[PDB]
Structures are given as C-alpha cells and as structure tokens.
Amino acid sequence: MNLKKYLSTAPVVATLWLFLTAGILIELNRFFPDSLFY
C-alpha cells in the first residue's frame, strides 16, 4: 500500500504540476487582467 510512490509517478506529478501552473496563470489573469507590456 505505497500510495505515495504512485502519486509520485510521471502522469500524476505532471498533471498536478501543470494544474498548479495553469491555476497560477488563471488567478494572475483575473486579478491582473489584460496584462500587456508589463
């Protein structure tokens, strides 16, 4: 019953990391919309 190892596999870790990245991007886009030319 090694759930940590499974959660550490490539698909799970990749989906979690990309989900966090997309969430950060979206959150930044609603708090700071239509960002251009810094």
Partner 1 sequence: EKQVKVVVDRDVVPTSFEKWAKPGHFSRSLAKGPKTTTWIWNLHADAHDFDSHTSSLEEVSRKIFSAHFGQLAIIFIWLSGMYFHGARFSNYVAWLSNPTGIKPSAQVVWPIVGQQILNADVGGGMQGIQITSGLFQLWRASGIVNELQLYVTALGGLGMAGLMIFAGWFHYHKAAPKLEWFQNVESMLNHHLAGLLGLGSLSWAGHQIHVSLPINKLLDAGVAPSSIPLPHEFILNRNLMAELYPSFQQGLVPFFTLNWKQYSDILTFKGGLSPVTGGLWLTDVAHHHLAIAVLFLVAGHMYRTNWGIGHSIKQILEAHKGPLTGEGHKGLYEILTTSWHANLAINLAMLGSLSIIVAHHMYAMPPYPYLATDYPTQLSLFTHHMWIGGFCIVGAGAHAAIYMVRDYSPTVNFNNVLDRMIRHRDAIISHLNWVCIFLGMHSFGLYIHNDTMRALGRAQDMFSDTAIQLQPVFAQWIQQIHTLAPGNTAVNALATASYAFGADTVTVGSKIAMMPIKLGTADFMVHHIHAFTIHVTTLILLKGVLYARNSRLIPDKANLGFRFPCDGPGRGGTCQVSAWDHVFLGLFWMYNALSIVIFHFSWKMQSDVWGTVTSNGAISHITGGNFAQSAITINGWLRDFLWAQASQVIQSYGSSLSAYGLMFLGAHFVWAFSLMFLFSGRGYWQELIESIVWAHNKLKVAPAIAPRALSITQGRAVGVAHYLLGGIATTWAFFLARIIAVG
Rounded to 5 degrees, what angle do the CA atoms 2, 24, 4 make? Answer: 5
Tell me the C-alpha distance between 1 and 30, whole Å: 41
Query: Hey, which residues between 1 and 38 contact ligand CLA (CB under 6 A)?
Result: 19-20, 23-24, 27
Determine the Cα–Cα distance for residues 35 and 38; give it in Å rounded to an integer. Answer: 7
Report the partner that residue 20 touches, choosing among ligand CLA, partner 1, none (CB closer than 5 to 8 A by kind). ligand CLA
Is residue 38 a contact point for partner 1 (CB under 8 A)? Answer: no
The item of partner 1, ligand CLA, none sharing an interface with residue 9, based on CB under 5 to 8 Å by kind, is: partner 1
